[PDB]
């Protein structure tokens, strides 16, 4: 779970440095990564239904 948290933090940092507030995809990307953070303690099968 700790490594999953680290991976999600890396994704978020990278994507926020890449996309600025004027970028359209920033909000969807951040929302998806937030859903991942919420669903860390789960399996991919159960996480797909929620993050799709």
């Amino acid at each position: 779970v700790d490594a999953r948290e680290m991976k999600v933090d890396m994704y978020e940092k990278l994507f926020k440095q890449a996309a600025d507030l004027e970028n359209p995809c920033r909000m969807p990307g951040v929302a998806y990564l937030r859903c991942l953070r919420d669903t860390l303690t789960e399996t991919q099968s159960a996480r797909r239904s929620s993050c799709l």
Partner: protein
């Protein structure tokens, strides 16, 4: 006795000498709190304690600033993450 020119000293005395017991009590309370903190440190702690700091909230599930610890859900080979 007194006089108008001694109003400064009269006021200062009347307002300060009654506070000396409270000042001494505050000093004694600080000494006792330091003693208890040092006894607890000697007994042992998971994370360190800052002696001369106001508040020490750190524990196994709390940072040294009152927030939850990051990356503390699992276990680590080297033991505590701190």
């Amino acid at each position: 006795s007194t006089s108008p020119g001694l109003a400064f000293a009269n006021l200062t005395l009347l307002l300060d000498v009654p506070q000396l017991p409270a000042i001494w009590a505050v000093n004694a309370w600080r000494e006792l709190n330091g003693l208890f903190t040092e006894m607890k440190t000697l007994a042992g702690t998971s994370d360190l304690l800052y002696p001369s700091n106001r508040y020490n909230p750190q524990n196994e599930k709390t940072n040294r600033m009152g927030r939850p610890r990051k990356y503390n859900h699992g276990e680590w080979m080297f033991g505590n993450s701190y």
